[PDB]
Symmetry: none
Subunit: 73 residues, 10 copies
Amino acid sequence: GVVAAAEKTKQGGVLYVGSKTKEGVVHGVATVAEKTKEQVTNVGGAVVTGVTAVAQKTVEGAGSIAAATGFVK
Amino acid sequence: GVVAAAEKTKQGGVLYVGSKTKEGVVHGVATVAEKTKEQVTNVGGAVVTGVTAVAQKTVEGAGSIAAATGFVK
Amino acid sequence: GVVAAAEKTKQGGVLYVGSKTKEGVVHGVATVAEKTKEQVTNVGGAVVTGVTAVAQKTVEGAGSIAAATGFVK
Amino acid sequence: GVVAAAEKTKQGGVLYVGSKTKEGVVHGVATVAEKTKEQVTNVGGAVVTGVTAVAQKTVEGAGSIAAATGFVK
Amino acid sequence: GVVAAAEKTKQGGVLYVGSKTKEGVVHGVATVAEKTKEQVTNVGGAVVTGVTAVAQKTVEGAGSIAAATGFVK
Amino acid sequence: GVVAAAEKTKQGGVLYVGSKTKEGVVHGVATVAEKTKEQVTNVGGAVVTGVTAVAQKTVEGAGSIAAATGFVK
Amino acid sequence: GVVAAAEKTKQGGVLYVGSKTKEGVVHGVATVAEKTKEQVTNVGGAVVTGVTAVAQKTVEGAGSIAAATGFVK
Amino acid sequence: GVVAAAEKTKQGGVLYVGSKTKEGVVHGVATVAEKTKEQVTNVGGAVVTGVTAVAQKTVEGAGSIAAATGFVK
Amino acid sequence: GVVAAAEKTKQGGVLYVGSKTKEGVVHGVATVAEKTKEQVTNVGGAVVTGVTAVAQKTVEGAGSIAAATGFVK
Amino acid sequence: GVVAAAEKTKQGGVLYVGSKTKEGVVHGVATVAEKTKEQVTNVGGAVVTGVTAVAQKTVEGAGSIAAATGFVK
């Protein structure tokens, strides 16, 4: 029983970024391996990967993740 | 039983980014492997991968992820 | 039972980006492997991959993903 | 039972992007492998892959993905 | 039982992009492999792949994807 | 005075190569540029460019090269 | 005075190479530049560029190179 | 006075190489630059660039190189 | 006075190499720069650049190099 | 007075190498710089750059190098 449920019921200043750079190496969510048996990646939210990264009001509602892995039995 | 459900019921300033750069290497959500048996990637949300990345009100409602992997039995 | 359901019932300032760059290498959601048995990619949301990436009100409602993989039995 | 269902029932400022660049290499959602048995790609949402990428009100309603893979039995 | 269903029942500012570039190589959703047994690509949403990519109100309603692969039995 | 002179006055076991390969990219003597004023290439000897390259008793006598370039005066 | 002179006056076991490879990228004598004023390449000898390269008794006699470049005066 | 002279006056066991490899990237004599004024390459001898490189009795006699560069005066 | 002279006057067991490797990156004589005024490369001898490199009796006689650079005066 | 002279006047057991490796990165004679005025490379001898490098009786006779650089006067 791997169940995920989500509900969202709606009964309805200044940001300045200045970036000067050179030779930027950026890595995000990176999983590196040798000889696995299983690999899983679930992204319910937001992954922002930049040289300049700005986020505003981003992950604002009703997320759910259910993960079951393995179970040899 | 791998069930995912989502419901969204709606009964209804200044952002400045200046980026100067050179030779930018950016990686997102990257899973690298040798000799697996299983690989899974679920993206319920938002993946923003840039040299300049701006997000506004992005992942705002009712997401769900259900993942089941393996189960040899 | 791999079931996904989604419902959306609707009973109904300034953004400036300036980018100057040179020789940009950008990768998105990239899964690289040698000798798998299974590979799955589900994209319920939005994948924005640029040298300049701007997102506004993007993933705003009622998404669902159900994934079942393997089950040797 | 691999079932996906979706319902959408509707009872019904300024964005400036300036990009200057040279020699840009951009990759989207790319899954690269050697000797698999199965590969699946489901895109319920939006994949935007550019040198300049702008998204506005993009993935806004009622999406669903159901994936079942393998099951040797 | 690989079933997909979708229903959509309707009882019914400024965007400026300036891009200057040279020698741009862009790849979309690309799955590259050697010696598979199965490859599947389902695109329920929108894939935008450009040097300049602009999306507005794009994937707005009632999509569904059901995929079943393998099942040796 | 750009003078070249050459004189050649003649008063007169087992080689086994086995090559197995795939997807070979080979470049020779390659000069690549943007916005020059002058480019010169003089080849008095031998340029062997292969995937399999074997040379035997190749550049064996009396070569001469004279190069003068520029001289704004 | 750019003078080159060469004179050659002649008063007159087992080699086994086994190569097994895949996906070989080989570059020779390569000069790469942006915004030069002058580029010169003189090859009095032998340039062997392969995936398998074998040379025997190759550059054996009487070579000469004279190069003069620039001299604004 | 850029003078080169060469004279050659002649008054007249087992080699086994086994190479097994994969995905080899080889570079030779490579000069890479941005915004020069002058570039010169003189090769009086032998340049062997391979994945398998074998040389036997190669650069055996009478070579000469004379290079003069610049001299603004 | 940039003078080079060379004279060569001739009054006239077992080598086993076994190499097993994977993913080899090899660089030779490489000079890398940003904003020079002059670059010179003279090769009077032998440059062997491989994944497997074997040299036998290679640079055996009478070489000469004369280099003069600059001299603003 | 940049003079180089060379003269060579001739009045005329077991080597076993076994190499097993993986993921080898090898660099030769490499000079890396930012904002020079002059760069010079003279190679009178032998440069062997491999993952497996074997040299036998290599630089055996009569070499000469003369280098003069600068001299603003």
